[PDB]
Amino acid sequence: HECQCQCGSCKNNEQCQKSCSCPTGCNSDDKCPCGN
Numbered sequence: 001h002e003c004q005c006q007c008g009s010c011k012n013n014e015q016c017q018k019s020c021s022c023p024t025g026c027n028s029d030d031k032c033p034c035g036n
């Protein structure tokens with residue numbers, strides 16, 4: 001999905017901007033699954 005994360009790993013990360021698997025509201029790296 002379109003990426004609307006505010007975590008450090010994803011915010012302005014071009015790799016997952018249009019291919020993000022995170023839960024909505026994924027705002028913390030500690031619980032971020034992106035690219036798992």
Ligand SMILES: [Cu+]
Binds near residue numbers: 002010020
């Ligand atoms: Cu995302």
Ligand SMILES: [Cu+]
Binds near residue numbers: 010020022034035
């Ligand atoms: Cu991401």
Ligand SMILES: [Cu+]
Binds near residue numbers: 007011033
């Ligand atoms: Cu993330």
Ligand SMILES: [Cu+]
Binds near residue numbers: 015034
């Ligand atoms: Cu992302």
Ligand SMILES: [Cu+]
Binds near residue numbers: 003005
């Ligand atoms: Cu993601």
Ligand SMILES: [Cu+]
Binds near residue numbers: 003005007020032034
């Ligand atoms: Cu994310």
Ligand SMILES: [Cu+]
Binds near residue numbers: 025
């Ligand atoms: Cu996130």
Ligand SMILES: [Cu+]
Binds near residue numbers: 005022031032033034
């Ligand atoms: Cu995430």
